[PDB]
Design a protein around this ligand. Structure first.
Ligand SMILES: CSC[C@H]1O[C@@H](n2cnc3c(N)ncnc32)[C@H](O)[C@@H]1O
Ligand SMILES: [K+]
Ligand SMILES: [K+]
Length: 547
DNA sequence: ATGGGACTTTTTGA
DNA sequence: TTCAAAAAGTCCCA
């Protein structure tokens, strides 16, 4: 619970260099560089060294242009601390350590150091800043205290709503206190580039700064032993004529970040691709792909006349609120106590394959159908009641909306007890399966069924055929939310926006999917024929979409 | 024992 | 009344 994260030195040197690379110290020898989340001083200590080289290399020009008694090498250290370096952190010990480090850069009157121990989101900042760098805290909607969220919802509502992250507000604060003509460069999670929550934040950035560069590391592990995916955003408040973004997108998530001495060498190498995006062409969604992918994506969008949302009804799985209380192995002897009318088949995300679901190994006790506590007393006493204390702490039980033994979000049984399509909520590839067995699931598996009015235009067999194809795997990943290494989010807020088509190839595509399903359900599966049938289907789909 | 792969709960705002 | 989003994921192993 330290809360302090060490940014890799190669990232720190890149961010500091990207802001101070072309600063004109002769024109402005009083630049104000700020880190509002400085921690122990990863960025500010490097800012000191860059500034010290800058002043020393131009000391005689400064001496000649301005006060010749003020601009001496022996005075550079005092000048940097008084007028240039600013830091803020909520952690007293980190500020105390950083104060010692800045003091020890040179070893008389004491020197005032512009280090504030405060909440950067509450501090009344008395002026704006030329340069802002650093690494803000990332805290999501579960790990943030509710009283603090009430404050964020009221004062940061332009970027913070619903399931937004704390670092959204640091983007707003950094932008707000950045001088005209200033430059900001930060490392944050990448998820705001695509997530539904980040929509308002994306609008705020696009409308208030010129985005110079986005370095997207995708699923690469920048922070050791940390489950987060990172990007570097550099932006400015300069009067720009044309506003194009440099986008550096990693191509191999397996790289060791220290392959070169500098991050610039990595960005220019074959490990990264570069392309430009017109900031004026950004909609609420930022589609940051190269020209080949953009042509591909636009081709499918224009050709497809329906979306899944148009033809399907989507829903999230059961949320029991305590899985250990209600989920049992199908061979558990405790299920002899439960009448089979209470038992539902239960699958996990790993049970979903392309076109078909694995046989379920677990059973859900649909405890909502338990009428009285005196009837079915043994089910409550010997199975569900083993977790009564944990069950009573669920929000709806504390308020009395749910009895302690009920499912927290049991949804509607009828939605699950029908032919439907299921997909994992997080996966490396498109895996849409037809469920024939009335499978229930938690929120790690999503489902949809086709609306009645569209059943004559679209069959489940046709839909899983195109959705599992290599075309639609690539098509979905163009705009999908990249979570971690080899994991995209497959959530309705993007899955339901997938567009679909029907044309002369419908019958052959549907027939190939039926053949694959028939093979996959056999005892002695020969998977080889399935792969050949998939290749032929991919050719039909590419012909249909003209790609 | 650190790095990498398999796999994914329930809290929460709206 | 009841929906769906959210990785500073989580856990294990050689
Ligand atoms: C550089 S890693 C994130 C840093 O942000 C700091 N931090 C967390 N919350 C805040 C806040 N509200 N204001 C300023 N710094 C913060 C933490 O103490 C940590 O050192
Ligand atoms: K002079
Ligand atoms: K990662």
């Amino acid at each position: 619970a330290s809360g302090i994260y060490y940014t890799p030195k190669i990232i720190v040197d890149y961010i500091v260099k990207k802001t101070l690379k072309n600063h004109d110290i002769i024109k402005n020898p009083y630049p104000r560089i700020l880190d509002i989340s400085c921690g122990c001083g990863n960025f500010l200590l490097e800012v000191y060294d860059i500034l010290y080289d800058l002043f020393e290399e131009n000391i005689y020009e400064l001496k000649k242009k301005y006060d010749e008694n003020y601009w001496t090498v022996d005075n550079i250290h005092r000048h940097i601390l008084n007028y240039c370096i600013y830091g803020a952190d909520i952690d007293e010990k980190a500020i105390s350590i950083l104060k010692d480090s800045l003091t020890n850069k040179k070893v008389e009157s004491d020197i005032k150091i512009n280090l504030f121990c405060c909440d950067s989101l509450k501090k009344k900042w008395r002026y704006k800043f030329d340069y802002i760098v650093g690494n803000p805290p990332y805290i999501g909607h579960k790990k943030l205290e509710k009283k603090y969220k009430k404050f964020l919802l009221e004062k940061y509502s332009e970027v913070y709503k619903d399931k937004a992250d704390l670092y959204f507000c640091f983007y707003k604060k950094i932008i707000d206190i950045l001088k005209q003509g200033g430059i900001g460069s930060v490392i944050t999670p990448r998820y705001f580039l695509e997530s539904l929550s980040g929509k308002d934040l994306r609008e705020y950035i696009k409308s208030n700064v010129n985005v110079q560069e986005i370095v997207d590391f995708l699923g690469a592990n920048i922070f050791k032993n940390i489950g987060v995916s990172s990007c570097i955003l550099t932006f400015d408040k300069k009067k720009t004529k044309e506003t194009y973004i440099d986008v550096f997108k990693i191509k191999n998530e397996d790289i060791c970040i220290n392959k070169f001495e500098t991050l610039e060498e990595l960005l220019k190498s074959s490990k990264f691709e570069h392309f430009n995006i017109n900031q004026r062409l950004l909609s609420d969604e930022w589609i940051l792909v190269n020209k080949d992918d953009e042509t591909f994506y636009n081709k499918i969008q224009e050709k497809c006349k329906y979306s899944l949302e148009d033809i399907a009804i989507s829903f999230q799985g059961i949320i029991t609120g305590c899985d250990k209380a209600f989920i049992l192995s199908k061979d558990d002897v405790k299920l002899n106590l439960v009448d089979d009318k209470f038992l539902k088949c239960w699958i996990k995300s790993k049970n979903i394959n392309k076109y078909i679901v694995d046989k379920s190994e677990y059973r859900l006790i649909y405890s909502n159908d338990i009428d009285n506590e005196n009837t079915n007393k043994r089910i409550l006493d010997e199975i569900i009641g083993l977790y009564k204390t944990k069950l009573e702490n669920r929000r709806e039980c504390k308020s009395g909306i749910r009895k302690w033994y009920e499912l927290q979000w049991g949804r509607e049984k009828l939605f699950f007890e029908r032919k439907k399509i299921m997909y994992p909520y997080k996966s490396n590839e498109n895996r849409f399966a037809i469920d024939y067995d009335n499978n229930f699931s938690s929120a790690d598996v999503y489902s949809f069924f086709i609306k009645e009015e569209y059943l004559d235009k679209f069959s489940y067999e046709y839909l899983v055929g195109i959705l599992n194809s290599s075309v639609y795997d690539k098509y979905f990943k163009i705009t999908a939310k990249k979570m971690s290494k080899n994991i995209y989010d497959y959530y309705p807020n993007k899955v339901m926006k997938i567009r679909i088509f029907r044309d002369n190839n419908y019958e052959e595509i549907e027939n190939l999917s039926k053949q694959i399903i028939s093979i996959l359900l056999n005892k002695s599966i020969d998977k080889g024929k399935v792969e050949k049938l998939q290749i032929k289907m991919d050719n039909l789909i590419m012909d249909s979409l003209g790609i």
